[PDB]
Design a protein around this ligand. Structure first.
Ligand code: MN
Ligand code: MN
Ligand code: MN
Ligand code: MN
Ligand code: MN
Ligand code: MN
Ligand code: MN
Ligand code: MN
Ligand code: MN
Lengths: 84, 99, 92, 102, 106, 93, 77, 96
DNA sequence: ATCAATATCCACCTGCAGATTCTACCAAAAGTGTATTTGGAAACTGCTCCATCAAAAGGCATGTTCAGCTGAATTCAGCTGAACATGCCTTTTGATGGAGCAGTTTCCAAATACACTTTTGGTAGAATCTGCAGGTGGATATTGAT
DNA sequence: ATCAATATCCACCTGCAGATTCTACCAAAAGTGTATTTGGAAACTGCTCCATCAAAAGGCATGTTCAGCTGAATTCAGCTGAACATGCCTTTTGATGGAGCAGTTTCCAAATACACTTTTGGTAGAATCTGCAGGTGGATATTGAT
C-alpha cells in the first residue's frame, strides 16, 4: 500500500558514515570508504534481519518484535542490552 | 581581510571529540527505517515492525560500525597512514572472522 | 549408563557414500565430536525456541527452525529437505 | 521395526529421542517426529563431511579417512568451513603462501 | 508463626524465591534445585549489580548529575577491566570512551 | 498482562550504594538485560556441571563453580564471598 | 620453563602459519602470548577438575574449558 | 660450497610444515610447562596423557592461527617480517 | 635467459608392525501394547499499537570551489635476521615397580518435591515529584594568519 | 611571538516530560504435612599415572658470514577537508482505521506412563591388511656463470 521501497541503502549518507567514523576515532577518510561501508552494513543488516524474521515466522506472527531482533543478535554473538 | 579557515584536520579532530562525547544515533532515523523495511520485505512480504524492533536494529548496526571503524583505524595507523581505506576495512574484517 | 558413541552410525554412512573407504580412529573421534557438537547446538536452539513461544514441546517445527538458524544456506535447505523426507517416510 | 529404519535412517532415532528428552525443561515433552528430524539432519551433515573427505582420501590414494582429509574437506568448502569453526586436532592447515612472500 | 522472606532470611535484596522458581523451570527432565542454590544465585546477581551501579554512580556523580544513564553504565563497564571482559554486550545509547590516537593529533 | 522484572531489586541496591542517585528508565532496561544475561549464563553452566558429574540436583556447589568459570579474577573472589555468606546466613536460620 | 618453548619450535609454528621472515623479538612475545592462553585454559580445566572432586585433570576437563572459551576442540571426546 | 639465498629455505620450510600435521613443540618441555602452570591453581594435580595432548593441539592451533593473522598485519604494512607490533595488532582486533 | 652443477622434493618400492575391521557375548535400552492424561490448537474476542498520511519548518544533505598536506613512488645503506657448520645436551624411547585414585556398587538420613492453604511482596496505573534539557551569556583556550 | 576569530567550557535558570512514589489488588511466595529421591559416606579393587632409571640420537645452541629488508629521507600530483549557498526531506506530533497480538474456553490429537519382550551396541580379542620406515631414482627447482 505504501510506496515501493527501492535503493534505500543510499539513505546511509556520506555525512552519516563520516559521523560514525568520527565516533570511531577516524580523522581522514578515503573517498572509496562510503560505498565499502554501505556494502558492509547491508550484509550485516541482512544477516540480522534474516534471523529476526525466522523467529517471527516461527512464532506465527506478522510483526517483528524487539525480542525477535534481540534473539537474532544473540544468535550472532552480538548481544544487545536495553530492549528486553 | 581574509576569511578564517581552519587547517585540514582541525575540524575533523573537533568532530571526533564531539561525537565521542555524545551518545545519540548518527544515522537518520526515517532512512534507516526504510532500509530495514526494504530488506525485511525482501525476506517476507507484508511484515510489520514494532518501533522498538527498528530502534534495536539501529543501535546494533551503529555499534557494529563504530567498532569496525575503530579496528579499521588501527589498521590504517599500522601502515603509517591517518587515512582509512577499503583495504583497512577488509583487513579488520578478515582478522575478525567476518566474511 | 552405557558409554555411547556415534561410531557405528558414522561407519554405516561411510559405507553408504564410499563403500571402499575406511576411517582412522582419530578421524572417528573427530566425527563423534562433530556429531555431538551439532546435536547440542540444534537441541539448544530448539529448546529456546519452544520457551520463547511459551511451549514445552520440542517438535520437528522447532528442529526445522533451529536448522534454519544454525546452518549456512545451501546446507540449511538440503538439511531441511532431508529432515522433511525422513518425517514423511516415518509417518507413512 | 526400529524407528530409524521406518524413517530410512542410519542414525539412531530412539537414542536421539532419549537425548532430546534429557534436554527439556521441567514438564518438557518431545514430539513424535522431532527425533526423526534431528537424526536426519545429523546423518545428512555426517554424509556431506564423509563424502568430501573420502574424495580427498581417494585422491591421495589411501584407503582411510584421517583428520587431515577431514580438515581439507571442511576448510575447502565455504559452507562447512563456516559451520565448523572447531579445531580439527591433527588436521594441520590448508597450504597457502601469500603472493608477496614468493 | 508469621511468614519470613527467604530473601530476608538470606540477608539479600534480590528475590530468592522467584530465582528459585526460575531455576526449577530451566533445568533437566527430572532436575531438582537445592535450597541454597537460589540463595547463592541471588547473592551473585545482587553483588554484580552492586558493582556495576557503584561505578556507574561514581561516573554520574563526577559529571554532576543525579541519574544514571546508559552513558554512565558504558563508561563504568568499559572503564573497568574485569567488568569489560565480563560484559561484551552492546550497551544501547552508551557511546564510546574518548580516545584519539597519538599519531592523529598534529 | 502482568510482567515481572528485576527493576525494584536493582533500585534497592542502587539506594544502598548511592543513596542520592536515581536511574533513567533506559539504564534500568540495561540493568534488567544484564541481570537476565548473567542469570542465564550461570544457570546453563550449572546444569551442564550437574550433567557432567551425573548429579540430578543443581546445588550451591554447581552455582559456585559456574561463578568461578564465568567471572574474571577479583570479581570471582568477591562474588564467591557474597554467595557463601548468604548461604551460611540462610542455613543458620 | 616457558623457555623450553624454543626459538625453532616457535619458528616451525610460524612457518605452518605461512610466515617467511621473523623478527628477533617475536620469540619472547610468543612465549608471553602462549603463557596467557595456557593459563586461561588450565584455570578453567582445573575448575572443572575440582568440581568433580577429582585430583587428575581429564581430557574432558580440557575440552569443556576450551569450549567455554570459544575455542572448541574436536577429537578428544 | 653451495649456499641458498636468504628466504629460499624459509619458503621451503613453509611448504614443508603446511604439508604436515605433526605437533611442532617438543613433548616433554610442553608437558613441563603445563604442570608448572597448573601448580598455581591446585596442588598434586595429575594429568591424563590425553589431556596434555589436548592442551597441545589447542595451543599449537591457536598459535598457528595467530601467526596467519600476524602475517596479514605485516603484509598490510608492506613488510615480509612479522614483528611484535603485528602480533599486538592482530590480538587487539581479535578482542584478546 | 642458456646451461651446466647441485640440492631437494616426490612418487614409488617392499616387509611387516600394528592399527583397523571383524566377531560374538550380553547388560542396557529400544519398541510394543495398553492405558490415561494433557498441552496447545482452534475459535472467539478485546483492544493495543502499527501503517500511513498530514503539515510545517528548520536541521541537515548535497554539490561545488580551492589548496593543504597526504599517500604514493623512489632510493639506499645500516644492520638484522637467514643460512650453515659444528658440537653438545635435552628429549625421546624403552622399561619397571606401585602408590594413588578413579570408577563401582550399597544404603539411607538428609534433602527436595508436591498439593493445598495463608499471606504479602510486587505490579499496573495514577498521582506526585523534580532533574535536566535546552536555552543564555560570558570567560578561556585554541587556532591560524600576520 | 601578537591579535582577531571562533570554538569550547562553564556558570546560571525553569517547567515539563520523565522518574519516583502511592495505592490496592492479587499472583505467587511461604507454611504445613507428607512422599519420594539422592548424594555422599563407606568399603572395594584394578587401571593408570608417577617416579626412577638408563642409553643415545636427533635436534637445539652458538658463532660466522653477508644478503637484502626495513626504515629513513625526499618529492610532488592530486585527493580530500573546510566552507558555504541552496533547498528538501527528516523530525515531530496527531488522526484514523483496522491488522493482528493477546486473553479465554474447550476438548482432542498428541503426548506421557508402565510392564514386558526383543533388539542393540560397547567391549575386547582375533583376524586382516594398511600405511610407515626407509630406501631409490627420477622430476623439479635453485644457484652461479655467462
Ligand atoms: Mn524488495
Ligand atoms: Mn484422572
Ligand atoms: Mn490443559
Ligand atoms: Mn650491503
Ligand atoms: Mn504489602
Ligand atoms: Mn545543558
Ligand atoms: Mn549388533
Ligand atoms: Mn618416508
Ligand atoms: Mn645407494
Amino acid at each position: 500500500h505504501r510506496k515501493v521501497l527501492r535503493d534505500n541503502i543510499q539513505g546511509i549518507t556520506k555525512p552519516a558514515i563520516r559521523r560514525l567514523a568520527r565516533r570511531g576515532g577516524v580523522k581522514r577518510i578515503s573517498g572509496l570508504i562510503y560505498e565499502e561501508t554501505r556494502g558492509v552494513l547491508k550484509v550485516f543488516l541482512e544477516n540480522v534481519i534474516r534471523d529476526a524474521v525466522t523467529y517471527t515466522e516461527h512464532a506465527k506472527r506478522k510483526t517483528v518484535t524487539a525480542m525477535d531482533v534481540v534473539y537474532a543478535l544473540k544468535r550472532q554473538g552480538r548481544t544487545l542490552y536495553g530492549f528486553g | 581581510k581574509k576569511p578564517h579557515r581552519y587547517r585540514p584536520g582541525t575540524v575533523a579532530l573537533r568532530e571526533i571529540r564531539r561525537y565521542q562525547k555524545s551518545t545519540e544515533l548518527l544515522i537518520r532515523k526515517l532512512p534507516f527505517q526504510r532500509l530495514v523495511r526494504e530488506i525485511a520485505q525482501d525476506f517476507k512480504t507484508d511484515l510489520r515492525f514494532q518501533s522498538s524492533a527498528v530502534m534495536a536494529l539501529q543501535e546494533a548496526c551503529e555499534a557494529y560500525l563504530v567498532g569496525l571503524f575503530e579496528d579499521t583505524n588501527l589498521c590504517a595507523i599500522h601502515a603509517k597512514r591517518v587515512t582509512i581505506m577499503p583495504k583497512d576495512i577488509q583487513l579488520a574484517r578478515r582478522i575478525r572472522g567476518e566474511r | 549408563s552405557r558409554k555411547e558413541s556415534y561410531s557405528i552410525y558414522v561407519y554405516k554412512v561411510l559405507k553408504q557414500v564410499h563403500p571402499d573407504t575406511g576411517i582412522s580412529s582419530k578421524a572417528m573421534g573427530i566425527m563423534n565430536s562433530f556429531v555431538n557438537d551439532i546435536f547440542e547446538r540444534i537441541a539448544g536452539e530448539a529448546s529456546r525456541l519452544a520457551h520463547y513461544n511459551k511451549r514445552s514441546t520440542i517438535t520437528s517445527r522447532e528442529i526445522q527452525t533451529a536448522v534454519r538458524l544454525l546452518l549456512p544456506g545451501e546446507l540449511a535447505k538440503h538439511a531441511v529437505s532431508e529432515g522433511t523426507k525422513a518425517v514423511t517416510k516415518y509417518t507413512s | 521395526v526400529s524407528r530409524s529404519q521406518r524413517a530410512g535412517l542410519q542414525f539412531p532415532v530412539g537414542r536421539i529421542h532419549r537425548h532430546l528428552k534429557s534436554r527439556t525443561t521441567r514438564h518438557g515433552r518431545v514430539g513424535a517426529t522431532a527425533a526423526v528430524y534431528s537424526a536426519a539432519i545429523l546423518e545428512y551433515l555426517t554424509a556431506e563431511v564423509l563424502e568430501l573427505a573420502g574424495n580427498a582420501s581417494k585422491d591421495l590414494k589411501v584407503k582411510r579417512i584421517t583428520p587431515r582429509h577431514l580438515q581439507l574437506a571442511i576448510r575447502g568448502d565455504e559452507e562447512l568451513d563456516s559451520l565448523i569453526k572447531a579445531t580439527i586436532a591433527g588436521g594441520g592447515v590448508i597450504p597457502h603462501i601469500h603472493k608477496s612472500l614468493i
